[PDB]
Design a protein around this ligand. Structure first.
Ligand SMILES: [Zn+2]
Length: 264
């Protein structure tokens, strides 16, 4: 079987679709707050009793690097799936990086390819089945990429505002510009200064939709929206496990579809 643990939805969906039915994948945190998530002794115990723990990046789940198998006498394989990927710093001249690479199809696709290389490396008797499921996912990912890259070039509106800075990589890939009401994390709420900057930014680029998210309180988003004449819609950074039973990419497609509609 091989027990695979996973940090949050994105990691869960990529490792699962790539694993198929071969293993038993579980998710540590399915709720919200991955940014401020901190494991319980039950959680780490779970990680250690696992054969494989998959997480996104130390820049997000910093707690993960604190995990030490050799010491705890565990046979677990801690794997940081975005390690090969290169993160943009949050601000020009800043020691911190933006971890929201999964909302960008291409990076998501290649993160899933790295995850499959791990599964294959830890379970050689199925190495073929893994890379086979990864190519499919990545191919779809490119398919999804080619699609929206066309839809967006046919939209003259390019800017949108989101609840928190979680779509920089998605925007960057489709030639769109974004600004987050909050920072890399939803807890990093705006001072009265930034609010007015968000406002003047909305006015500057005639942004007509402020995208809130199910994870946080839309008060501030509604506020800005009422003061700048823009309306509020919901856009998911996929940090929380989506309702329904769509594929990861299907879930992503649905989100950049609303993006395309609001922007046109
Ligand atoms: Zn985030």
């Amino acid at each position: 079987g091989m027990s695979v643990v996973t940090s949050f939805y994105p990691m869960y969906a990529m490792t699962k679709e790539v694993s198929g039915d071969l293993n038993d994948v579980r998710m540590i945190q399915s709720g919200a707050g991955i940014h401020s998530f901190e494991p319980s002794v039950n959680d780490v115990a779970a990680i250690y009793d696992a054969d494989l723990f998959v997480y996104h990046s130390h820049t997000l789940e910093a707690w993960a690097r604190d995990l030490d198998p050799n010491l705890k006498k565990s046979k677990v394989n801690v794997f940081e799936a975005s390690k090969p990927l290169t993160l943009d710093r949050v601000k020009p001249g800043a020691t911190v990086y933006d971890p929201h690479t999964w909302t960008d199809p291409v990076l998501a696709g290649e993160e899933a390819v790295n995850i499959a290389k791990e599964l294959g490396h830890l379970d050689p008797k199925h190495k073929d089945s893994y890379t086979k499921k990864a190519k499919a996912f990545k191919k779809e990912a490119e398919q999804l990429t080619e699609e929206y890259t066309q839809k967006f070039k046919k939209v003259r509106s390019k800017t949108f505002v989101t609840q928190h800075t979680a779509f920089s990589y998605l925007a960057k890939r489709f030639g769109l510009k974004q600004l987050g009401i909050s920072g890399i994390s939803p807890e990093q709420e705006p001072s009265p200064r930034q609010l007015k900057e968000i406002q003047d930014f909305v006015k500057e680029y005639n942004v007509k939709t402020i995208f809130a998210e199910d994870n946080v309180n839309p008060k501030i988003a509604h506020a800005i929206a009422k003061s700048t004449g823009a309306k509020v819609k919901t856009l998911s950074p996929l940090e929380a496990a989506p309702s329904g039973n769509k594929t990861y990419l299907e879930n992503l497609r649905a989100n950049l579809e609303v993006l395309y509609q609001q922007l046109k």
